[PDB]
Amino acid sequence: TAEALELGRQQAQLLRRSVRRFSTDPVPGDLVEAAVAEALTAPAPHHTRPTRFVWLQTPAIRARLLDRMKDKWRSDLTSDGLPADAIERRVARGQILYDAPEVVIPMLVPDGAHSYPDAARTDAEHTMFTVAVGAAVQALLVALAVRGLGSCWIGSTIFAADLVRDELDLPVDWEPLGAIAIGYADEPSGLRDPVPAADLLILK
Amino acid sequence: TAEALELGRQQAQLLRRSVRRFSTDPVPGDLVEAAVAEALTAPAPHHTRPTRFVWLQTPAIRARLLDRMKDKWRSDLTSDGLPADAIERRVARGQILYDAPEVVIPMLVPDGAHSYPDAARTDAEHTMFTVAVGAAVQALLVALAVRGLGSCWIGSTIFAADLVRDELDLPVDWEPLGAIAIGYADEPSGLRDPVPAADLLILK
Known part of the structure; x- marks a missing residue:
């Protein structure tokens, strides 16, 4: 147990x-x-x-x-x-x-973003916010799996940001970060058995 | 069981x-x-x-x-x-x-990135790669958690990318996306009990 x-x-x-x-x-x-x-x-x-x-x-x-x-x-x-x-x-x-x-x-939305006068720190903040949204994405895909629900994240809407905002009537500073399809898997799969990180993990 | x-x-x-x-x-x-x-x-x-x-x-x-x-x-x-x-x-x-x-x-590294002639799709592809690394960040934090290990992600290095590349001797297209401190938590804490999403979930 x-x-x-x-x-x-x-x-x-x-x-x-x-x-x-x-x-x-x-x-x-x-x-x-x-x-x-x-x-x-x-x-x-x-x-x-x-x-x-x-x-x-x-x-x-x-x-x-x-x-x-x-x-x-x-x-x-x-x-x-x-x-x-x-x-x-x-x-x-x-x-x-x-x-x-x-x-x-x-x-992504700039809720709590710092206002910097310079492009460098403005871009850095934006990148930081983007990483956070990606974290939330994984957490969603997992939280669905754990409820027995299949899902797929695809970049999609990142390439059509204006279309998405226009069609959904959302303000200019909401940034789409893809699309998550959700449903019961048509054909079940066995579990991942991850391989070692090998060259994806760098030691310094 | x-x-x-x-x-x-x-x-x-x-x-x-x-x-x-x-x-x-x-x-x-x-x-x-x-x-x-x-x-x-x-x-x-x-x-x-x-x-x-x-x-x-x-x-x-x-x-x-x-x-x-x-x-x-x-x-x-x-x-x-x-x-x-x-x-x-x-x-x-x-x-x-x-x-x-x-x-x-x-x-972030552009391994498998598509080469587009235009800035729009180039920036989109970069955004898409950024979200994925964020997703991998969450997954590491959780994979450490289930093994009894605490962690903290901090935006940190995003605001000093050139220094990180210079200090670590990494090529120009390796882009740092924060830093993850890892250890046994000094004080234990129970399971989270997440609040409903409320205004963070928009219905369309």
């Missing part, structure tokens, strides 16, 4: 997978709320609240936002001189945001 | 505190390495490795980097016209990094 509970603690993050395919089972709303409450236990700089989670419950609003992001995405890749074949293969990786039972957009 | 396993999973992230005071009990290296390995299960964009962890095992190296950082800190705050006592109160907040049993610098 003691061994099992310690094991469980060391399985929590290993339950976390970047799930591509979801079942059509509905997701109980209270699990998302409770998961988000747990995500916001991630650390943040003193007296700041860098993270906001924006839950796209209205299906028509999600679809309109994604459709516009898709149009930007095709037009960008079309400027790059990509052939139409390779464009649909690229944009089709975003279909998961259309199909997921629920989508949540993590956002 | 089925319930104990379920409970252990649920407890994981709730063991994590931003710990400010550690005991002098030495940190087993094994646990840091395994925690770092778990940390790297955090999500990353496809075919990238955005994160490196730089473990400052050499005391004189740690000490010299921090001294250089402090000097820059006092110098910035002095330009701002802060009075000396106020400079010193701010600078004292960094003492935790001197005293911590172990310190690990999380870093």
Whole structure:
């Protein structure tokens, strides 16, 4: 029992997978709320609240936002001189945001930011706030897993920040930091068994 | 044991505190390495490795980097016209990094980054990499927690990137994303009990 509970603690993050395919089972709303409450236990700089989670419950609003992001995405890749074949293969990786039972957009906001007159420290503060939001993202993906819910974070909305703010009527200083698809995994997976860090850990 | 396993999973992230005071009990290296390995299960964009962890095992190296950082800190705050006592109160907040049993610098590196001709997508890709490292930061803090080890992430090095690169002999595109002090907490603390998300969760 003691061994099992310690094991469980060391399985929590290993339950976390970047799930591509979801079942059509509905997701109980209270699990998302409770998961988000747990995500916001991630650390943040003193007296700041860098993270906001924006839950796209209205299906028509999600679809309109994604459709516009898709149009930007095709037009960008079309400027790059990509052939139409390779464009649909690229944009089709975003279909998961259309199909997921629920989508949540993590956002940065400057709540508690210091005001510096110089660009260097202004940028540094912004980067610090961004790291904090990413922490909250992992905490969400884990808090969902631990409630049996699959999820996938994708950069997505970072490349369409204006579209996101416009479509959601959000102020200029809310910065989207991707999109989190949520649902019951269509096909369950076994746990992660992490490999050693090897060259990803540098000793000085 | 089925319930104990379920409970252990649920407890994981709730063991994590931003710990400010550690005991002098030495940190087993094994646990840091395994925690770092778990940390790297955090999500990353496809075919990238955005994160490196730089473990400052050499005391004189740690000490010299921090001294250089402090000097820059006092110098910035002095330009701002802060009075000396106020400079010193701010600078004292960094003492935790001197005293911590172990310190690990999380870093961004553009391993697998896409090369775009335009600033917009270049900055987006960089943002996306930054969020991922943040996610790996949370994951390390939690992986350390489930192994009985406290930690604290501090924005610190983000405000002195050139010095960190110079002091550690790292190439220009390694970007420090704070610092993580690690140790056995000086005073135990119970599990967190997160409050509801409230105004940090926006419904759309």
